Design a binder for this molecule. Structure first.
Ligand SMILES: COc1cc(CCO)ccc1O
Ligand SMILES: COc1cc(CCO)ccc1O
Lengths: 300, 237
């Protein structure tokens, strides 16, 4: 179990650690988060009390380094940094734990929620979507745009998700226009899976990461990416059976975790009605369709 | 974006454009089977591709063999239309290709956009106008060439005959749409109006009779009456 210490908490802020959050008051004696489960990526994330504008945060994996948070009063945000001096870090954490100045990552033993939301998400893929190679952790916020969004303006600060565009030469084989547009199996299986992602695990990892950025940071382009990746599978007649069963599980836990009051902004009525009720895979997502009907029947 | 009454004069500027109407591509008669079920029998159809400025009519005849062994024919008909329009554009030299294609039904947008991905600089547009191009098969010579076809075929006509020698393309298009609206609302009456006088003939190489300017005014007036008449016959007004 690893630790992310904080130098201090000089401004009042809501701090999220994955699906959990806690409020910290201005200059409250808060020195970080302990008992973080090893084996998964994590995201620490922030919303300032004075300006709920720009939810922001950091994706990290404690196996890759010792990370801490320190407020920067010039740039006005909580920044993640890496500590390279291993004995300094250990001695900082031990003192903060001894004075009980840290909150505990509050996971229930029965509860696989975070694993189920991050099963295919790896730090190394995150760092190719979020390019800042001098750090082992990745910053994301509410306003960052995606490469595809920019084609339709700062490249260094972009989310480099894989571009998916159903009316594009990549998606449509010359002479298979109707076939490929009405059945996207070619684009899913050959272009994207075999060609770009190499396997379904990498595809699911990007889908899961897009959902988590959409939910945690209200990142609109991430939400577009999540729905496009769902729609590309649902609109394919030919999908490996293990991928459909895994997709149903992935989406099930995303919809289950999703707060009820954010559904209006995070869920696209057209994609979900198409996917559950008209698409080739309308009968393949039993768990997702049952939770969607019982939790968001208005949307449908 | 969409083509409507506000930007109607754009049709007669010097940017090449085409209207595409797919109403008459997939045509059927519905009948009873010996067992008393219902079935369809396709008949030849046509794509109506029109340059509104010049009157160029590219009539691609759709022979019933193109449907043989195919399913979901009303959906296929839109993609077949888009394939044939795309093939037409590609055959043309660059300077002669359209800068916009206006489809008369919105269900043609995605099929045509997908077939024209190779032409990102050609705009595919819908329209809010209710254009009466479905009535093209009420023009006797167009109907004749479609029904006689034994194979796929492209037939070329000027839908304005020689009118542009005397009138502008705005006026010619307005005449065309009035004639077609009339044929669509009451085909028998409309055709009675157009041929009533045996001394006014249709030249072999024309579609419509050789009216003088003054006789076209009478004709055009008689067509307005018909459309209003039918509007009363229809609504009891
Ligand atoms: C902790 O922060 C958040 C948690 C959730 C998931 C609650 O199941 C959604 C949005 C958030 O900002
Ligand atoms: C020159 O007159 C015409 C030319 C064409 C071919 C234009 O690609 C079609 C119809 C016509 O009346």
């Amino acid at each position: 179990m690893n630790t992310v210490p904080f130098t201090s908490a000089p401004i009042e802020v809501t701090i999220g650690i994955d699906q959990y959050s806690f409020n910290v008051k201005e200059n409250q004696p808060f020195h970080g988060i302990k008992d973080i489960p090893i084996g998964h990526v994590h995201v620490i994330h922030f919303q300032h009390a004075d300006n709920s504008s720009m939810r922001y945060g950091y994706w990290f994996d404690c196996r890759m380094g010792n990370f801490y948070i320190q407020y920067d009063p010039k740039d006005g945000l909580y920044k993640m940094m890496e500590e390279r001096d291993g004995a300094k870090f250990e001695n900082i954490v031990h003192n903060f734990k001894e004075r009980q100045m840290m909150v505990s990552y509050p996971k229930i033993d029965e509860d696989d929620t975070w694993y189920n939301l991050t099963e295919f998400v790896q730090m190394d893929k995150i760092r190719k979507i979020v390019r800042k190679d001098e750090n082992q952790f990745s910053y994301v916020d509410s306003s960052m745009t995606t490469v595809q969004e920019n084609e339709l303006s700062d490249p260094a600060h972009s989310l480099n998700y894989t571009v998916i565009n159903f009316k594009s030469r990549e998606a449509i084989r010359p002479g298979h226009e109707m076939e490929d547009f009405l059945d996207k199996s070619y684009y899913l299986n050959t272009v994207m899976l075999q060609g770009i992602f190499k396997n379904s695990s990498n595809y699911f990892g990007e889908l899961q990461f897009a959902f988590l950025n959409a939910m945690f940071f209200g990142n609109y382009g991430s939400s577009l990416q999540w729905h496009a990746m769902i729609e590309l599978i649902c609109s394919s007649a030919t999908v490996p059976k293990h991928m459909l069963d895994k997709l149903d599980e992935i989406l099930y836990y995303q919809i289950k975790t999703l707060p009820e009051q954010y559904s209006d902004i995070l869920l696209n009525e057209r994609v979900w009605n198409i996917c559950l009720y008209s698409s080739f895979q309308k009968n393949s997502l039993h768990n997702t369709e049952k939770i969607m009907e019982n939790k968001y029947p208005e949307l449908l | 974006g969409a083509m409507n009454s506000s930007n109607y004069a754009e049709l007669f500027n010097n940017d090449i454009k085409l209207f595409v109407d797919d109403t008459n591509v997939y045509r059927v008669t519905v009948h009873k089977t010996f067992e008393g079920n219902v079935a369809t029998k396709a008949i030849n159809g046509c794509i109506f591709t029109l340059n509104p400025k010049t009157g160029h009519l590219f009539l691609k005849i759709i022979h019933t063999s193109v449907w043989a062994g195919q399913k979901r024919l009303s959906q296929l008909a839109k993609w077949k239309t888009a394939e044939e329009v795309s093939a037409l554009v590609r055959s043309l030299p660059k300077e002669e290709q359209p800068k916009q294609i206006i489809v008369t039904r919105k269900a043609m947008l995605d099929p045509l956009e997908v077939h024209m991905l190779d032409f990102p600089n050609i705009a595919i547009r819908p329209t809010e106008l209710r254009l009466p191009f479905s009535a093209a098969m009420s023009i006797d010579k167009l109907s004749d060439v479609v029904m006689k076809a034994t194979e796929p075929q492209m037939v070329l006509f000027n839908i304005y005959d020689d009118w542009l020698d005397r009138i502008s393309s705005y006026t010619a298009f307005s005449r065309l749409t009035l004639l077609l609206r009339a044929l669509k609302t009451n085909e028998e009456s409309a055709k009675m109006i157009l041929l009533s006088d045996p001394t006014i003939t249709i030249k072999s190489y024309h579609l419509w009779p050789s009216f003088t300017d003054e006789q076209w005014i009478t004709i055009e007036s008689q067509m307005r009456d018909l459309i209003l008449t039918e509007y009363g016959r229809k609504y009891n007004v």
